[PDB]
Amino acid sequence: NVHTFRGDNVHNSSSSL
C-alpha cells in the first residue's frame, strides 16, 4: 500500500514493467 507513496511504486512500476 505505501510503495506508491515512497518512490511512486519504483518509478511508476519500473516506468511500465
> Distance between CA atoms of 5 and 8, rounded to whole angstroms?
6
Residue type present at position 4: T
Q: Which element (helix H / strand E) includes 10?
A: helix 8-14
Distances (CA, A) of 14 to 9, 10, 11: 8, 6, 5
Q: Is the dihedral of CA 9, 15, 16, 17 positive or negative?
A: negative
> Contact at 8 Å (CB) between 11 and 17?
no
Let me know how long the chain is: 17
> Contact at 8 Å (CB) between 5 and 12?
no
> Distance between CA atoms of 14 and 10, rounded to whole angstroms?
6
> Distance between CA atoms of 15 and 13, rounded to whole angstroms?
5
